[PDB]
Design a protein around this ligand. Structure first.
Ligand SMILES: [Cl-]
Ligand SMILES: [Mg+2]
Ligand SMILES: [Mg+2]
Lengths: 207, 207
């Protein structure tokens, strides 16, 4: 299982500083949706330039014009781009076409999807590399939020998947046991007084 | 009925040039989702600065962290921001809270929703100023695409709504008859060799 850092910050400066401190402990560096909307595609280019041998994940969360959004993100340096599972099949298909053209990949973010396992199988057929069993910050804030719902969906999906939903060192084992290909950590890393140590500790928990 | 131009061009330079040519004929200037992801929030600020006398619509298509995305868009100069209807109710609520705090508004984009009429009523009950009966570019590219489906949903929901999806001079009358408070024109304007003339014609079609 790989470790992915979700840089859900608001400036390129902040993203670069964080990436510099945790890069050595992660396999994938994600530029969050708010970060991309804040700075534009240049943040993707800057991070890839500073970490050329790391997998750069652009969380576009594309909802329409799949081929176009995927293409511009890939051209900007992204190795992986996200398209929402809620998007039309043709939108996901378009993003996949762009991914094939660049020998890169599309990750379908299943955030907000009620039938995650079912949708996962459907988008896998469209060409997604893997799907993200994702619970956003607003969903995580709801009382009673349980990470096991995402893990259960991932197991039933039978599609390569990543898990994003407030993952911490304590839950890394459960995420890996569910068969996740990637464990995503956001707040556990950027919200810590010592981001570098947080990333290192998350990495150490991986079997 | 008001006229909104959806500037989905990919550069701030091109967006400002287009805005300057059509501002006189429109009530709302929209910065499209791909444009915001390409250039970042700076494009919202640049457009509002050049057109303080126009309602600036930031098509964020927020899917998570409703309050956060609404906040940064409003801070950048947007008067209205979009949140996806497929987002969690709490995400829409978060955006609505930010809008209330800034004395601005949230528009819920119903793109990709099968039963737009029902969701329209649900999100209006969450505080949306109005909903956008929206059909994306990928959906419109499918043979047989019909605009009347969006109008039907708008008429049925009985909630303030706008229409976006291939709107042209020929369909303006139908959009207005359906009761739309705003008609959104994208390609009909920015795809024209003469955007000014295109916008002028669209405006002339409004009763
Ligand atoms: Cl590197
Ligand atoms: Mg993400
Ligand atoms: Mg738009």
């Amino acid at each position: 299982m790989k470790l992915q850092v979700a840089i859900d910050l608001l400036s390129t400066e902040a993203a670069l500083e964080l990436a510099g401190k945790v890069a050595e402990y992660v396999d994938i560096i994600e530029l969050g949706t708010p970060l991309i909307k804040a700075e534009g595609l240049s943040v993707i280019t800057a991070v890839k330039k500073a970490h050329p041998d790391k997998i750069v994940f652009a969380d576009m969360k594309t909802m329409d014009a799949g081929e176009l959004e995927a293409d511009i993100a890939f051209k900007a340096g992204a190795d992986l781009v996200t398209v929402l599972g809620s998007a039309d099949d043709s939108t996901i298909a378009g993003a996949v076409k762009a991914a094939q053209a660049h020998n890169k990949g599309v990750v379908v973010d299943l955030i907000g999807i009620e039938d995650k396992a079912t949708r996962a199988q459907e988008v896998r057929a469209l060409g997604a590399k893997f799907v993200e069993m994702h619970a956003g910050l607003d969903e995580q804030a709801k009382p009673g939020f349980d990470l096991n719902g995402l893990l259960a969906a991932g197991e039933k999906a039978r599609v390569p998947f990543s898990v994003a939903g407030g993952v911490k060192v304590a839950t890394i084992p459960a995420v890996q046991k569910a068969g996740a290909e990637v464990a995503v950590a956001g707040g556990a890393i950027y919200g810590a007084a010592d981001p570098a140590a947080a990333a290192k500790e998350l990495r150490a928990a991986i079997a």
